Protein backbone atom coordinates (compact mmCIF):
# COMPACT_ATOMS: atom_id res chain seq x y z
CA UNK A 1 0.00 0.00 0.00
CA UNK A 2 2.95 2.29 0.65
CA UNK A 3 3.45 2.65 -3.04
CA UNK A 4 -0.16 2.02 -3.85
CA UNK A 5 -1.68 5.07 -2.26
CA UNK A 6 1.54 7.00 -2.82
CA UNK A 7 1.60 5.89 -6.44
CA UNK A 8 -2.06 6.74 -6.71
CA UNK A 9 -1.35 9.95 -4.84
CA UNK A 10 0.71 11.37 -7.67
CA UNK A 11 -2.04 10.77 -10.22
CA UNK A 12 -4.02 13.39 -8.37
CA UNK A 13 -1.08 15.71 -8.61
CA UNK A 14 -0.65 14.39 -12.12
CA UNK A 15 -3.90 16.22 -12.74
CA UNK A 16 -3.22 19.94 -12.66
CA UNK A 17 -4.65 23.10 -14.01
CA UNK A 18 -1.09 24.19 -13.39
CA UNK A 19 0.93 26.29 -11.03
CA UNK A 20 1.83 29.60 -12.51
CA UNK A 21 5.29 30.68 -11.76
CA UNK A 22 4.89 34.41 -11.71
CA UNK A 23 6.88 37.54 -11.25
CA UNK A 24 5.71 39.39 -8.18
CA UNK A 25 5.96 43.01 -9.00
CA UNK A 26 4.97 44.06 -5.48
CA UNK A 27 2.16 43.96 -2.97
CA UNK A 28 -0.17 46.58 -1.58
CA UNK A 29 -1.86 46.52 1.83
CA UNK A 30 -4.70 44.92 -0.18
CA UNK A 31 -3.09 41.52 0.44
CA UNK A 32 -3.40 41.17 -3.30
CA UNK A 33 0.16 40.70 -4.40
CA UNK A 34 0.80 42.85 -7.45
CA UNK A 35 2.32 40.38 -9.87
CA UNK A 36 3.40 40.23 -13.45
CA UNK A 37 2.78 36.81 -14.79
CA UNK A 38 5.91 35.72 -16.55
CA UNK A 39 4.63 35.80 -20.14
CA UNK A 40 1.59 37.88 -19.24
CA UNK A 41 1.36 41.35 -17.80
CA UNK A 42 0.81 42.28 -14.19
CA UNK A 43 -2.04 41.07 -12.04
CA UNK A 44 -2.52 42.31 -8.51
CA UNK A 45 -3.79 39.18 -6.95
CA UNK A 46 -4.28 37.59 -3.58
CA UNK A 47 -1.56 35.34 -2.25
CA UNK A 48 -1.45 31.86 -0.86
CA UNK A 49 -2.97 31.97 2.60
CA UNK A 50 0.26 30.47 3.99
CA UNK A 51 2.52 33.13 2.45
Distance separating alpha carbons of residues 33 and 26, to the nearest angstrom: 6
Q: Which residue, 15 or 29, has its beta carbon nearer to another protein?
A: 29
Q: In the range 1-51, which residues lie near another protein by CB under 8 A? A: 25-26, 30, 32, 34, 40-46
Breaks (C-N over 2.5 A) in the chain follow: none
Q: Which residue, 9 or 30, has its beta carbon nearer to another protein?
A: 30
Nearest to 24 by CA among 1, 47, 50, 49: 47
Total binding residues toward another protein, as defined by CB under 8 A? 12
Residues that bind another protein (CB under 8 A): 25-26, 30, 32, 34, 40-46
Amino acid sequence: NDKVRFIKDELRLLQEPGSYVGEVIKIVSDKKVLVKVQPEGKYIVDVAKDI
